[model samples]
Target: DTANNPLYKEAMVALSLKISIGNVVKTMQFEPSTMVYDACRMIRERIPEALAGPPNDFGLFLSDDDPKKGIWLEAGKALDYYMLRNGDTMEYRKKQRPLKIRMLDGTVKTIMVDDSKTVTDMLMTICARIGITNHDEYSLVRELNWLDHGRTLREQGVEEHETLLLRRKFFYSDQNVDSRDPVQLNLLYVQARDDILNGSHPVSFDKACEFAGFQCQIQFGPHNEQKHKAGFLDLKDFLPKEYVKQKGERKIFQAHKNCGQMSEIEAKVRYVKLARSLKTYGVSFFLVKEKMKGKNKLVPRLLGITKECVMRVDEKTKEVIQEWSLTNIKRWAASPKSFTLDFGDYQDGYYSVQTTEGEQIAQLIAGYIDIILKKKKSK
Candidate 1:
């Protein structure tokens, strides 16, 4: 058995600790003794569970002791999870310190040093306090400030700490689909609401389920009982860039994210066009199916970056007629090979690659081709 998967202990050693109030040599001070550790743990506990919003209305305290330096405390105002300085005390704020805390569960939490706690700790705490073991399993938006100055905005109710906490808790509940594509999510909401409000996109309530996995309909009223004026919203005005980042409210917290690398179609086009342009200049290109030696073998991609063309030249015309070279292919993904140029003057000739940059290859091809084709006509 190992640390993570230890076999049942062949022999068990049990120990008990008991403290007698009478044996207490001195009464512990609340401001900075055992009180300190307790405060640190308490703040640690709330960081995740508190669901505090951007304009932090809460504070956290952490305390530790040094043999020579007597017990000291560190703390700050936690906004979203990053800790800001306490308004009262200014110098050496502990917002960036690693917290020394103990969880009731045997598992010791490995946390980052954020003497100034940020969204990371806040979300971490939220996961732990809820008894959810897989808190980190889900990505979170952390502390996002919700500002609505419009008329349909949710009432700006009294700023009670629990009010902040309750809203966070309800939104973070299960049934939320985790996606990285905000474009897709906003489109889903915008399309759904538009369809319902305009009476254009009509379907069974069951159909609405597909756009937002298990989320509520934008139209108001019980989803099951459909007979009511569709209370829908215009996503154009209501949706914010954050809609792509995170969605939240009284009964909803949804989000989408953009994932993976961008598309490559456009890149492929740029490469093809660049290569085609050099064809008239007696340049023939080929994507090396296999590697070769003594024949100029740089990958098409690497060659595209420098936009430098290598090739063979004609000794009689003083033109590059036979050689291999490269060109720059502009694409969304890393640079692509635009065109491959091969000259045919020498034993093997040289190849010149073409790029959008109008490299020497382009000018040489225009000049050399005009000269060669004109001589052929006269002959």
Candidate 2:
């Protein structure tokens, strides 16, 4: 009954797939090393089932005493649900995007609405239109066990509501208060208030119409915030520097003395961006792994090879312009020193391009020529 129901199935599928892929992509490149090729194959095979909520029964809950307890679903928070406009099937409807529906452990065949829907009878109408059988909001924190994590939804701004402005601010707290002070709690109080306000409706509710299906989008905001920032490698040795001379070469590159704190996305972005740059700068196919850090608190991570990698491999040249290697090259068993170059800058992994010996030689000399030309012109 649970797996067959549109309400229960798709959302479960989407949430589970995200958690699983999030797990694999996160742990791909590490000791007990499963090569990228094998991991990718597994991912492709698992995706359909993950998105569709397994072929047979996936039990309402996988944990003890909690049949409804989804692996990723937390109590009192929300068991992701969506409303459909015209269709009853678990597929994208023309007008409905998946919306967050708060969940309570006790069974209730109802739907709760968020604040935005309450404005101008829109919220009520949306619930009516979607066949919301019952509705009420609960403390997601209570369900989430916020106390254990040292936070509440109110603290996270998930349930808290603060007025953007109040007329009392201008009048002042006349009870022998500090009149010179200005209380600025709302985002509207900031200098960029208008710009920020203009950016409201952060995520498109219009897109939330198809929450019943596996592919329906959830989560707000983009991961890639900007074109460039201090990435993982950039912070690698961002502190005090010390040198260890190679036997006697004192001026040679020295070792780093300290490490920097990586804000999660700041680190993940490193691998993601390196994958893109490999193609952007014409590097060949490669894989990367990293010692996981930050919020995810995961151990090793396996990032994708990046779409850019394969795109750069020219079938004609059988080479990424500047990179060199074999089309079917297996460097795993080969001596590490046998490779022409090793770079962690791309990501904590290897980048091998297939090419003939002559091609490799020519590519190296080209780099030298470019440097020599630049130096001679300056002289």
Candidate 3:
């Protein structure tokens, strides 16, 4: 008896459906025998955000008549239940708009969506496209502005070609790994510490987070926790137990807690000011820890060595016992994994440095001195 039912007469009856959202008319094919609910889903996939944020908030209407005064057709029933013909027209109406979202990964997507959808909805879609299925661990941002969770995209003024930055959310679960789910606070510590230990100028915690692909500020513990004496507090000791167990101990970890929750824009301002403060000092020079002849060596060093002046210090005491400035220097040659700074008949002989990052460092340092000398000659 069901097989003989009129609804099954043409199970796949082709009908023309018009989607009316954002004042735009979109045409698509649909089967008259398809459930109204199923048709609604098709519309969502075809024109994302067409329906109101709440599910089942939109329904098809007879389009042959006036769209504004159209009759609400039953979505719970089959498409053929309305006695739809091959060329019949149905209009879809809901509060939605077309939004152009450009993700950080350089992918752009257009979704016919509505203001009712929150920023979280926008983020989830972007994350899915980037192979990040766990949407809860991410958020959408715009130029140091955190698109608040509760607000709708429309309220946030999200528009076409408006770039939104993707940021990782902090998680305390011990199961996460550093290579994948990086710890927010720990990353800041590592970045600043590594720069300092490498004789590179240290940056603010906020800047360090940016280097690690995170965009949050550091919050530190109370005054007493940092010992009434104030300066920069160690951020590493406050890390979760799992971090220490997995990542070996290193001195490249420190920060002040008490990091307050500020708007993304405000945090950017604070970081910018902090970065400027470091510029007042001249060329950054520091002591770098190294290894030589199977023993620990701390060498006093200046970044971007120049042909004009290069020095080899007492590795054990960090005191400069040998100096190569202007007169005793020859041209430098570098290999893929090492650099040879020729002293040309000096008793100290040539200095050879080997490291995986040697080639890159050599080129940068060599280029810097070249520019400096050229500028002096021009002046």
Candidate 4:
């Protein structure tokens, strides 16, 4: 209807864009009247590694961080959908590709990764191989360098056939949480150890002693007093980030002595299982501001969703002041910058949260609900 005046595309308004791939920013042009679909196809024709392939191979993102973590410009929407956006470069990256991974020894193997776009998408795929029930505890990186959670592997300079390290940047395990393969178990144990050693996951001194016992046994086989002193174990290696000062290796050494002759595999399984039992084990939290009903001012709060429930936690204390069972959370909706959770009881009123991460947060809750339903269906 609107295209009747445009005989052979008559327009002078060229929306030039600085297409950022990795750190390199390049110039490209499109009309304000151009559709997003047309722009992506044209872009695909110009970028690295493409020849008349699917335009969906890349997504034009508004977020300067990782496109995976940033705001989506949306498909089927117009080029001018966000003309309010300026200076900030739009990013583009691949949705899938193959990559080589190093095992840190003499061995390396090849693995293909994806979301067609999201780093989350590729992460879930990798998690299955490790049999990680809680995927948020780890992250994909180039050895020590982090892959941004925002965008595609390719645009982030994760080249095809490049080496990757799926590191446990933090830190869990149960039978249900058990992996299907030894490689899976091994990865879980390593991730757990790495996470604990790196001081990412927090635990009590008692639990730390228990973890150190297993770790010490796995490393040295038998605990010899003279050989395995505070010098033998860098107490820093087995403790969380909070205990950076290395307060109690004597107790850890004492604990290690009591570990008996536990086998390497057995010790690993125990480590995985024990770490999995923490209350804050797999909760992914989002920082949010809740409007105080009485004062009409926003209060900072932590909004987190677990497989079990949703929590409105006090930011500093990490205490759940308001809790809602997922069963009670029947429906939820997210606008551009606000979220609404519709509970079963009308008396509780509406719990609305304001945050820039509303889209990702809503989808996260949606995913949990989907998992819940699929599990019940399996039963």
Residues 273-358, candidate 2: write the lDDT tens digits: 22223222222122222222354432321111111122223322223433322222232222222222334344355643222232
Q: In lDDT terms, how accurate is model 1?
A: 0.29
Question: How would you encode candidate 4's per-residue C-alpha lDDT over 1-379 as one tens digit per residue?
Answer: 3555645676546777878776668778777777777777787778764333466556776764443344556677888877734344777755456766664222566666653457766777777864556666456667535566656775666546567876643322234435456666776687666656654455676788888888887888778877886666565667775664766787777777777877777777888888787765666677789888577788888887777788887776667798888778878888888988889674368788898877767766766665566657858
TM-score, candidate number 2: 0.14
lDDT tens string, model 3, 298-335? 33343333334555544333344455664565667766
Relative to the true structure, candidate 4 reaches a TM of 0.57
TM-score of each: 0.19, 0.14, 0.27, 0.57
Query: Residue 223's C-alpha lDDT in candidate 2?
Result: 24
Q: What is the C-alpha RMSD of each candidate to the true structure, in Å?
A: 25.8, 27.0, 19.5, 9.2
- Model 1 segments beyond 4 Å from truth? 1-123, 139-209, 212-227, 230-379
* Residue range 257-284, candidate 1, lDDT tens digits: 1101212222222222322233222222
Backbone collisions counted per model: 47, 22, 10, 11
Residue 344 error for model 3, in Å? 2.2
Query: CA lDDT of 199 in candidate 1?
Result: 26
Query: Positional deviation of 171 in candidate 2, in angstroms?
Result: 51
| C-alpha local distance difference test of each model | 0.29, 0.25, 0.48, 0.68
Q: Which has the greatest TM-score? A: 4
In angstroms, the error of model 2 at 150 is 30
